[PDB]
Paper text:
A 60-kDa FAD-dependent oxidoreductase, [name] allosterically switches between two distinct redox states. Oxidized NAD+ and reduced FADH– form a long-lived charge-transfer complex (CTC), which stabilizes and maintains the reduced dimeric state of [name]. NADH-activated [name] dimers support import of OXPHOS subunits by CHCHD4 and are critical for [name] function.
To understand how SAXS CX1 and CX2 chemotypes engage [name] and enable dimerization, we crystallized select fragment hits with the [name] dimer-permissive mutant and wild-type [name]. Crystal structures of the [name] mutant bound to CX1 fragments and the underlying 4-aminoquinoline (4AQ) scaffold revealed that these scaffolds localize to the NADH active site, mirroring the native NADH ligand, as do CX1 and CX2 scaffolds bound to the wild-type protein. To accommodate this amine interaction, the aromatic side chain of F482 must rotate out of the binding site. Halogen substitutions at positions 7 and 8 (fragments C12, D1 and D3) optimally accelerate dimerization. In addition to hydrogen bonding between the primary amine and [name] active site, the structure of top-ranked fragment C12 additionally reveals a unique halogen-π contact, which places electronegative fluorine compactly against the F482 and H454 aromatic rings, reinforcing their pairing. Although fluorine attraction reverses and rotates the aminoquinoline scaffold, the primary amine still hydrogen bonds with the active site. The dimer-permissive [name] mutant also allosterically releases H454 into the active site, absent NADH ligand binding. This points to H454 release as a preconfiguring event that allows CX1 fragments to engage the [name] active site and stabilize the dimer. When the [name]([name]) mutant is co-incubated with CX1 fragments, the oxidized mutant fully dimerizes and remains dimeric throughout the time series, similar to the wild-type [name]–NADH–DMSO control.
Numbering used by the authors:
A (entry chain B): 126 to 510, 561 to 611
B (entry chain A): 128 to 509, 561 to 611
Write the structure that this text describes.
């Protein structure tokens, strides 16, 4: 498709934050003409299903349909909207009452803030009246894998996109051993997914990471340790306290050497070791980057310059209640994207409604969280019967909450963090989550 | 006070006035309200440490008028009172105007409701707001830990009242000690030194650095400046760190960490500035933990309808990085820029501001950009000279020593960002051969 020379609303990146902004812009300006520029070839879609529901689908064609049943039981697509919801970029300036167009397979490579203009990888130039940067991030790699050969790189997956789910799902049906490097939520979710698939095929799934347990940087040690046992019981060989020294090929198999004496033989590697914000457009744009948290530095309204906002994983924003942060959650991309779209239509609203996070580690372990969640903060945990709540404290105030197997109570956790009261007994607060 | 005003400027100093003029020039019917905690109308401060001390008129303390370098006499006030309109008539007068509400302090900022609250309970809503609160002079821990008599005999020099009180003190006591080697402390030393020569009194200046402006100028130039300050009738004591200050038989006794002790009658502390950021709490506005002040972007904007300018603004310089500048011309430039952006300009800080200092009649300094003695420097001299401050193989700051009317040249060198193969050739641009 050809890109129009001018568009009122330009959204750079075609992910969750961009789509939520497009929906928000259209809801507030019913005749709005919104162009999304996406380097990926796919229309906007949500990523959480790529490590969860799509692996537990009953439909054996799930790799083709990309449909899944939600907790409510209703089936849906990973795509936020079907193609019929969008208009073509060529017809965008002509269609009555405007619409939302997605220019796929195109990357914005230059940003001219003074002239309100971008340049694409094919030389096309597009002027805008208001611009959203929603470029997300790029998965990090391991130094050991960067130093390894080309064969190792070709057998290492950085799990982010639909193509990664399709390649890894097919690999899980062809090889006998897959090793996941990374103890975060993504690595743990993939371990449970591959663990379930391995039980039916009789294959091997290994997860190794330097922490003492899964999500060691997020959950307290005792809860991190308990989570590791549940991941192990999903058919996963979990190796905590594991630092990769090198990776090589030995008789067709990948050989992982750890800083200790242990060695791991496997057929394929999946690296889930964090994200790097896509901030390359800051150079040509003269946009400030945050050296502490990374990403584009924006204010409480997600604004960088007069006609430029940033949302999603790439936005380092000022939280008037919690301080300067950068969040990499799905619901944050939705909330921050929606907020940006509103401010692109004159709302002038600060980030106020805190976004939630969630993770499913099998069918028996569900986590929900909100606010500042970091195992380095002091914590108070209250548990009962299997379930519990963990409060993260700062300045004698709750700044983060993790709900373990407690659902439909995120608004309560959100209000506790908003009120910012110095509680004399967190066990009484725990009763708000039906913990007695 | 009006209940509502389109343009509200918090603080009545250089940045506020420049913003009001800028707003009025772009929106000729604009109605601008300045809220100033001081009782005085907007005025420039540089004369308070220079021209007003070298005036021939013995009534200068009353007139607050001085002769410029051009020789034309003027007031420290930016405009006469007749230039302003009253706050009562501001919402009614044809074609609007600029009003100043003196003796009133904004004590609360409600960003959500576009509303401020004054110290007298008055509430004022706005459509666009400029925070130009400047800063407050810092004090010394040694003087804060001292008694009330020490505090009462220590001057923090910033306002008209400080000039009047210090001028009177210089005619009543025999020894004044300035603590601080910066531009303010050195200018006051030369001023009191000239005034002391006619009375035969004493002026002492002590600071921790090896010389005047040790944090700004390279060591060799800082030392040379110290000798010139001494020749103005000043006893300069470098490498001096105050350990404590007390009163001994009616005299102030300053005890230094190195064992030295100084007897004096009055102290002037010129040891830096603290940005007035108290409104950030109620306003939910971010402060910069590195440089201090309100954190704003390249357009000096904090929130949708709030800008910050002057000494209190920590802004992003797209060419030089995040900074906070405390110069007179920066308050003028940033204030003007804010006013333009408050009327839809959407312009980033681009025109670099200059600063200057006069240390007597024989030493004039002008500088621009990032000027810091910790940066690598190259000095080219001929009585006069230029000092280049380098970073990433590029000139990021320039100091001109006794070279005038060439700041646009220095400004262009920093803008071009060229990697010069020979800075001696560049010095020829400043008539240094
Ligand atoms: C497998 C997986 C599972 C997840 N599961 C969960 C979960 O269970 N719960 C949760 O809370 N979060 C989860 N997350 C995190 C959540 O998906 C992210 O926070 C969210 O996708 C971030 O949205 P975004 O719009 O900021 O960026 P992205 O979704 O990454 O979208 C950015 C898009 O812009 C493109 N782009 C980048 N630069 C340019 C450019 N210059 N020009 C054009 N296009 C460009 C990128 O290619 C990408 O297509 C998961 C993430 C992954 C990868
Ligand atoms: C004695 C002296 C000599 C100087 N000489 C030079 C020189 O030679 N060259 C140079 O480049 N620079 C010089 N400077 C620095 C220059 O004067 C300052 O950079 C300039 O005044 C900054 O302007 P401003 O608007 O940011 O703040 P200010 O001029 O300080 O104005 C702020 C005003 O706002 C008021 N205010 C604060 N908070 C509130 C509130 N909540 N409500 C209402 N009002 C409030 C403050 O009382 C003050 O009146 C000198 C400064 C001083 C003090
Ligand atoms: N000459 C000066 C006197 C007092 N304060 C100053 C602050 C900044 C500056 F650049 C110059 C000053
Ligand atoms: Cl000291």
């Amino acid at each position: 498709d050809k890109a129009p020379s001018h568009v009122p609303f330009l959204l750079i990146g075609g992910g969750t934050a961009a789509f939520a902004a497009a929906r928000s812009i259209r809801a507030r300006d019913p005749g709005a003409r919104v162009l999304i520029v996406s380097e990926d070839p796919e229309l906007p879609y949500m990523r959480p299903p790529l490590s969860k529901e799509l692996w537990f689908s009953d439909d054996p064609n799930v790799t083709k349909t990309l449909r899944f049943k939600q907790a409510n039981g209703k089936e849906r697509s990973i795509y936020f909207q079907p193609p019929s919801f969008y208009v073509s970029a060529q017809d965008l300036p002509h269609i009555e009452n405007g619409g939302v167009a997605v220019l796929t397979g195109k990357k914005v490579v230059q940003l001219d803030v003074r002239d309100n203009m971008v340049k694409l990888n094919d030389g096309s130039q597009i002027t805008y009246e208001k611009c959203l940067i929603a470029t997300g991030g790029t998965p990090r790699s391991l130094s050991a894998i960067d130093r390894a050969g080309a064969e190792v790189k070709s057998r290492t997956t950085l799990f982010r996109k639909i193509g990664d789910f399709r390649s890894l799902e097919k690999i899980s049906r062809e090889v006998k051993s897959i090793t996941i490097i990374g103890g975060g939520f993504l690595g743990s979710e993939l371990a449970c997914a591959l663990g379930r698939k391995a039980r039916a095929l009789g294959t091997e799934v290994i997860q190794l990471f330097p922490e003492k347990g899964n999500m060691g940087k997020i959950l307290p040690e005792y809860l991190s340790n308990w989570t590791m046992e549940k991941v192990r019981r999903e058919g996963v060989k979990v190796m905590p306290n594991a630092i990769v020294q090198s990776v090589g090929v030995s008789s067709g198999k990948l050989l992982i050497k750890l800083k200790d004496g242990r060695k791991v033989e496997t057929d394929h590697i999946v690296a889930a070791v964090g994200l790097e914000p896509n901030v390359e457009l800051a150079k040509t744009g003269g946009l400030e980057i945050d050296s502490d948290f990374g990403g584009f530095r924006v204010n409480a309204e997600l604004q960088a310059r007069s006609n430029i906002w940033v949302a999603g994983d790439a936005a380092c924003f000022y939280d008037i209640k919690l301080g300067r942060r950068r969040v990499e959650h799905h619901d944050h991309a939705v909330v921050s994207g929606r907020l940006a779209g509103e401010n692109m239509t004159g709302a002038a609203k600060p980030y106020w409604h805190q976004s939630m996070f969630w993770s499913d580690l099998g069918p028996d372990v569900g986590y929900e969280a909100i606010g500042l969640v970091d195992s380095s903060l002091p914590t108070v945990g209250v548990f009962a019967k299997g379930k519990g709540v963990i409060f993260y404290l700062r300045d004698k105030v709750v700044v983060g909450i993790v709900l373990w197997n407690i659902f439909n109570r995120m608004p309560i956790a959100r209000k506790i963090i908003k009120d910012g009261e110095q509680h004399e007994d967190l066990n009484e607060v725990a009763k708000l989550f039906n913990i007695h």
